[PDB]
């Protein structure tokens, strides 16, 4: 395999971390290939669930807990810390909150969260590589509690970073917030991509096309599929009660992506950097509720 940039996987990975049996597990948790029958039982369907009061309270809770766990990871970002150390803390934080770390064994994903450094677009596997000064790293968190999944992610700076990194991360967050600002009943899901690409393109960046936002609730990934690029064929119209994510991945160079031999790590084909931000949203009558919002601060960690 010909790597696209300077990053390389750092094996071996510590033995799989166990989750106490008292924590409720999703269906794929114990599947040999990590397959989700409940999810596949809807694969291909474009119909979108309309959550009930019970579902909404369930989503508000797991999403709040997921934010708490991302904040734990955020406090560990610094030169010298390995992504595996971050994952360990995330794993323990999920357990402490009586939640199962959704990524664990999801289609056999080996860890409890995704850590994506520099050219890694998404799904980076926490490993033995120490974070280096100047790196940017995204931590994507998803928790499962009482049958519901809560999903969010942020890109962080490791020590001081160059202007290019600052601009990429800042623009990516702005893309996310502009998209969220347009969410309300009646808006087509395909519209978000137009908003995102417009801003990314205006700043000299490209939008990843292989991965999209997604519905989430009793399932980790389900309808609707939400592309982040312009003129897409996304199917569906927003309605009060819908819950989904917007998680744009923006790149310094081209948008082309490819996967590492591990079957998960997605990287830019040109080896340039990529950043991402994500929130789980609940469409309301007046717009939308950002279920994964930070509660003790009006801004994401990178502007600190
Ligand atoms: C079923 C699947 C793994 C092929 C899939 O559609 N998957 C998907 C789509 C869009 C975004 N994200 C994912 C995903 O898995 N994300 C993960 N995060 C942590 C472990 S697996
Ligand atoms: Co994912
Ligand atoms: Co996510
Ligand atoms: Co997501
Ligand atoms: K990255």
Swiss-Prot record:
Q: Which residues bind Zn(2+) 3?
A: 140, 151, 278
| GO BP, one annotated term | protein maturation
Q: Which reaction does it catalyse?
A: Release of N-terminal amino acids, preferentially methionine, from peptides and arylamides
Coiled coil ranges: none
The Gene Ontology terms for molecular function here are: aminopeptidase activity; initiator methionyl aminopeptidase activity; metalloaminopeptidase activity; metalloexopeptidase activity; zinc ion binding
List required co-factors: Zn(2+); Co(2+); Mn(2+); Fe(2+)
Binding of a protein occurs at: 123, 221
Q: What class of enzyme is it?
A: hydrolase
Q: What is its main location?
A: cytoplasm
Q: From what superkingdom does this record's organism come? A: Eukaryota
**Keyword vocabulary terms for this entry:** Acetylation, Aminopeptidase, Cytoplasm, Hydrolase, Metal-binding, Protease, Zinc, Zinc-finger
- In the record's cofactor note, how is the cofactor described as bound? Binds 2 divalent metal cations per subunit. Has a high-affinity and a low affinity metal-binding site. The true nature of the physiological cofactor is under debate. The enzyme is active with zinc, cobalt, manganese or divalent iron ions. Has high activity with zinc; zinc cofactor is transferred into the active site region by the ZNG1 zinc chaperone.
| EC number assigned by the record | 3.4.11.18
Residues the record lists as binding Zn(2+) 4: 151, 214, 247, 278
Q: What does this protein do?
A: Cotranslationally removes the N-terminal methionine from nascent proteins. The N-terminal methionine is often cleaved when the second residue in the primary sequence is small and uncharged (Met-Ala-, Cys, Gly, Pro, Ser, Thr, or Val). Required for normal progression through the cell cycle.
Q: Which family does it belong to?
A: Belongs to the peptidase M24A family. Methionine aminopeptidase type 1 subfamily.
Q: How does it assemble?
A: Associates with the 60S ribosomal subunit of the 80S translational complex.
Q: What is this protein called?
A: Methionine aminopeptidase 1
Q: Which organism is it from?
A: Homo sapiens (Human)
